[PDB]
Amino acid sequence: AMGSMERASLIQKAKLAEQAERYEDMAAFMKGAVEKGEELSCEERNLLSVAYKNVVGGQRAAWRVLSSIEQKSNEEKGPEVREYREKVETELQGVCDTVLGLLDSHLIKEAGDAESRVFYLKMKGDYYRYLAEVATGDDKKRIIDSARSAYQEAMDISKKEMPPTNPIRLGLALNFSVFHYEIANSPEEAISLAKTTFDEAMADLHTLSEDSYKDSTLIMQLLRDNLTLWT
């Protein structure tokens, strides 16, 4: 539906939608911009990420509420709780599949710089992770391994190509630690990764401007917040 709108108009409208807190519209505008086929700038990658993280965040919150009610039900109240949890689940899967589709066609393959490639691979890890949260069985196993593989490729590039305080490197490590703790049943791997990431960023802070220091220390606090939750 966005095929007739200029790329620059799609970007401008995504920024308007963000101001209006209209995140579904924001995601649709950014999907349209990606589908123009040009690479995204740093600012545009961030719009894409913010839009979808807010859309999927709404669905994840709802899915948790409904899953909890369903689990409690398990007086008979009929199929309705399961049906509606499934509806929300299907819509959530559809959003994840859309994002993964954009990454595969063709954002990741054209991303040559470390900052873009790590950003997109982290996104690939995150959206497979959201799929894993609602998956069951071995179906679940291949999804978990897809998330793992994407995060691992991102980490390998980030460690070779970015400083330990780079915010995208920090955010990737934070989310991969969350993957280990919440999805992969590997709380020790989670704690080790978050601690090493934190310590290596601390040792690099002296190299940063006031503004970069603020950006890095904000994400380090998130790693610290998790380490406090986990230990």
Add this chain to the structure above:
Amino acid sequence: AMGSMERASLIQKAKLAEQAERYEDMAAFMKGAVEKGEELSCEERNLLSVAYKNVVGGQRAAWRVLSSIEQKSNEEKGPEVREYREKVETELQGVCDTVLGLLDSHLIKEAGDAESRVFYLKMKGDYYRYLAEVATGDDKKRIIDSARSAYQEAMDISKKEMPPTNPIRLGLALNFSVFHYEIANSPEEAISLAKTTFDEAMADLHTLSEDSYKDSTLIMQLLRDNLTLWT
């Protein structure tokens, strides 16, 4: 799309959607329930109202953000702000027209008890009021008069048939005062209505149980909050 689902399943899912904060789904489930053609109970009227008030509330908040940006623009940045404000405006009008359609087909005509009839006429006033907020010109005049007429019929019934502390009577008076202040350019009528409503409810509080007292005084505080904003 809800034609194949049982009425009771639609109601149950509306309550689930409210818990999950999925207000668009909640409105769709309640629209489906109304379209079954049976009258709504007090609890079901309240679900219908909560659902649509949240949906339209999101649109009104967005429309205000975009209208403000548009008015500021009036460097040339092209048609995009106007286009996107119009998109949001159209969707908002569509929601209002949907609610008004449900009231006209056939909720109001089958509502014989005071509590149902006043509730639906208040809703008719509110949704024409939301249409008036985005309307221009004389188009605007007939919309304002539709809101007025609906509120006036509701007030006439409420004054004849309900005690001055009845929460629906109180809410109707609050919203009609807001209509006078914000839409009809009649701040004196707004202040007079809110003050008389407040004073007449205060004099009736002695007749109420602890629980009814809590329900009434909560809405009286809203009338007081507006009177403080307006004087």
